[PDB]
């Protein structure tokens, strides 16, 4: 199974899949009810999370994470390691002896959910703060906006 590529069976803990109802229910269709939440700060849940079948517990809409803290924005730089991406934030720092600025940047690793498909490394992503998900990951992608070369 594509959904079952790991050594342990993957399921949404809130969902019970063994409701013995009737032979007709077996005959009719086997599609699990899915748990999705409304991560809400004006954000909308993508429809690929309500209709998807992926199993990932660090997703905000269909996983066990809470979004609180800071809302930030960045530009996608690298998509290489499994299920997480590296983004860049560019800012100006003020040096007051010369009354001038200098460009500085930060590289920040965020978690990317499967509900956000067809994303390339040029585009603006909004991120929300959550609990520590790994050693160097504390943010999670909440919205994807295409870059200047929008099709």
């Amino acid at each position: 199974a594509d959904i079952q590529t790991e050594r342990a069976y993957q399921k949404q803990p809130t969902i019970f899949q063994n409701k013995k109802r009737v032979l007709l229910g077996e005959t009719g269709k086997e599609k699990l009810p899915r748990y999705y939440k409304n991560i809400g700060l004006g954000f909308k849940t993508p429809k690929e999370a309500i209709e998807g079948t992926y199993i990932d517990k660090k997703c905000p809409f269909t996983g066990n994470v809470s979004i609180r803290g800071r809302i930030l924005s960045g530009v996608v730089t690298k998509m290489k390691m499994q299920r997480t991406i590296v983004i860049r934030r560019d800012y100006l720092h003020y040096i007051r002896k010369y009354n001038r600025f200098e460009k500085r940047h930060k590289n920040m690793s965020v978690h990317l959910s499967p509900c956000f498909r067809d994303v390339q490394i040029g585009d603006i992503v909004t991120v929300g703060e959550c609990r520590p998900l790994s050693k160097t990951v504390r943010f999670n992608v909440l919205k994807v906006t295409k870059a200047a070369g929008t099709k």
Binding site: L41, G42, R68, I71
Partner: protein
């Protein structure tokens, strides 16, 4: 530090206590209690420093252990007890009742009340929840847990508590057009009517308040205490009535006083 602290240095004490530099190295650290350390007035700084009934800290203990002071109807023999906003202090020997109310400068005032007014206090609502077997529970700014309240009372409201029984007699909701006092920040001690409340989800709300003279200011929603319904307060007010005078107006009002003398 390997544990909790038990001392307070005099320069680190809350400024509204009005403690001088050269009396000692230490200040009374308030005991743990219903009010916060930085938002309370300990009993020693009220009996000795404000009312001058005692000259030293040993005399405050002699007044307290005679069981003369009642804080909201109960005798407290602790001399660093954290009394706070809206509390009622009763000295039966001299027949005095006081209410802890901020003045316009942000300091607790010596506000004497009548024996009838000392029978109740106004309490903000901090938390509402449901406990075992579906019993509603309140938690106030005074750390009072009051169960089976009215279902119309919500967070940020004000209730009236009869100090003899500890039960709710009335309440005021939070809405525009209601009187309030500021209990923190830069507008501490100011009294005015709520005009607007702008909501910032995921962050702190902001409430706009207008005085009786037409001056408008804003505060965080956690620094607002609803006093009365409309323009009429539910408790007696200090001398300044919550209006903040400018330094020029205060200077003119002070100079006019000494000319009157003669």
């Amino acid at each position: 530090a390997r544990g909790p602290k038990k001392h307070l240095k005099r320069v680190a004490a809350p400024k509204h206590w009005m403690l001088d530099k050269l009396t000692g190295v230490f200040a009374p650290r308030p005991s743990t209690g219903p009010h916060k350390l930085r938002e309370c007035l300990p009993l020693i700084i009220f009996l000795r420093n404000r009312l001058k009934y005692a000259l030293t800290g040993d005399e405050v203990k002699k007044i307290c252990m005679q069981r003369f002071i009642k804080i909201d109807g109960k005798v407290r023999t602790d001399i660093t007890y954290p009394a706070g906003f809206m509390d009622v202090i009763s000295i039966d020997k001299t027949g005095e009742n006081f209410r802890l109310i901020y003045d316009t400068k942000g300091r607790f005032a010596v506000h004497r009340i009548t024996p009838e007014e000392a029978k109740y206090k106004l309490c903000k609502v901090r938390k509402i929840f449901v406990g075992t077997k579906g019993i509603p529970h309140l938690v106030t700014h005074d750390a009072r847990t009051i169960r089976y309240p009215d279902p119309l009372i919500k967070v940020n409201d004000t209730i009236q508590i009869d100090l003899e029984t500890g039960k709710i007699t009335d309440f005021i909701k939070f809405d525009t057009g209601n009187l309030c006092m500021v209990t923190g920040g830069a507008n501490l001690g100011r009294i005015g009517v709520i005009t607007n409340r702008e909501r910032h989800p995921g962050s702190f709300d902001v409430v706009h308040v207008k005085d009786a003279n037409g001056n408008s200011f804003a505060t965080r929603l956690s620094n607002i205490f609803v006093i009365g319904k409309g323009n009429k307060p539910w408790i007696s007010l200090p001398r300044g009535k919550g209006i903040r005078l400018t330094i020029a107006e205060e200077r003119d009002k002070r100079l006019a006083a000494k000319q009157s003398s003669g």
